């Protein structure tokens, strides 16, 4: 695997001894495998073990799944940016295989937005600035990927994570499974039409299979909508095909409920039909920052 002018393999991954790893609790699962909270320590008893998330590989898997799992580790390990989850190391010499990741106690961004929606029992659980900070965090991650010529291909709330639920939380890109599949096979290899994230994809991506850094720009727009709608599914009344037809004919989503105009404007700029008309992430960040500077934007009430 090559990134930012460097090539690496399985051996550059820090293999941590299996006996040093303890599983604490289940956190979740994606399509394939599980994620657990864990602790690492080479010392009994260790007053302060390193807390981690542990992503597992099902033992019942193909040799292609194993290589997929390997590639996920390498990809994460090669990033170096505060808005991308860290890889602490791996435990590949024991079964089931582990990838050790930065623990993100806030969980995934979609789930967080749904669960932390303001509603009588939690009237001010979240404010406009919280949403702008999450957006800026992910935009920073995306800019880092852009400058390093890495196309994520699935910039969505389900793929982002939070360091904690409360104030001070930092949003980070966590799931690189899509890019991994393309890097290994050249196409979505275990997927198919029904599994494609078409609701996050620009016209040239789903029509021509053309992906650039302007692909991620489009997707980031949809993520902005997700953030400012407080976790609704994009194009909520529409199926994937209806979205395909809607988007290709120039259709775009309305603003989320209570969304400030400057924020909505950023979404529509990200959704320009021609990729060359879409902003790069440095511009997106600049425009997000400008939003945070506007008291009228940040003093806007979220809907209850």
Q: What angle do CA 28, 34, 37 make, to 5 degrees?
A: 65
- Residue 55, annotated as binding a ligand: yes
Please confirm, yes or no, whether 46 is among the known catalytic residues.
Answer: no
**Ramachandran assignment for 258, one of left (phi > 0), alpha (psi -120 to 50 degrees), beta (any other):** left
Q: Dmax of the chain from CA atoms? A: 63
- Residue 29, annotated as binding a ligand: yes
Identified catalytic residue from 154, 277, 294, 296: 154
- Residue 104, annotated as binding a ligand: yes
Catalytic residues: 154
Q: Which residues are annotated as a binding site for ATP?
A: 29, 55, 102-104, 175
Q: Which residues are annotated as a binding site?
A: 29, 55, 102-104, 175
């Amino acid at each position: 695997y090559c990134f930012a002018g460097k090539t690496s393999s399985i051996s550059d991954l820090k293999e941590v001894p299996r006996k040093n790893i303890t599983l604490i609790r289940g956190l979740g699962h994606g399509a394939f495998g599980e994620v657990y909270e864990g602790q690492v320590s080479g010392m009994p008893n260790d007053p302060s073990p390193l807390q981690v998330a542990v992503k597992t590989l099902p033992e019942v898997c193909s040799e292609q799944d194993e290589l997929d799992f390997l590639m996920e580790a390498l990809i994460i390990s090669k990033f170096n940016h505060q808005n991308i989850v860290r890889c602490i190391g791996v435990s590949l010499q024991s079964l089931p295989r582990f990838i050790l990741l930065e623990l993100m106690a806030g969980g995934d961004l979609k789930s967080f937005l749904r669960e932390t929606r303001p509603r009588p029992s939690q009237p001010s659980s979240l404010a406009m600035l919280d949403l702008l900070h999450v957006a800026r965090d992910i935009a920073c991650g995306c800019q880092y990927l852009e400058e390093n010529h890495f196309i994520h291909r699935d910039i969505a709330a389900r793929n982002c994570l939070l360091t904690c639920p409360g104030p001070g939380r930092v949003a980070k890109i966590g799931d690189f499974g899509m890019a991994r599949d393309i890097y290994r096979a050249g196409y979505y290899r275990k997927g198919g039409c029904a599994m494609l994230p078409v609701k996050w994809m620009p016209p040239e991506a789903f029509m021509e299979g053309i992906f650039t850094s302007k692909t991620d720009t489009w997707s980031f727009g949809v993520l902005l909508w997700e953030i400012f709608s407080l976790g609704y599914m994009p194009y909520p009344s529409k199926s994937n095909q209806e979205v395909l037809e809607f988007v290709t004919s120039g259709g775009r989503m309305d603003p989320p409920k209570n969304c400030p105009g400057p924020v909505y404007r950023i979404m529509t700029q990200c959704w320009q039909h021609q990729p060359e008309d879409r902003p790069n992430f440095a511009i997106i960040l600049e425009r997000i920052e400008y939003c945070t500077q506007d008291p009228d934007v940040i003093n806007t009430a979220l809907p209850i």
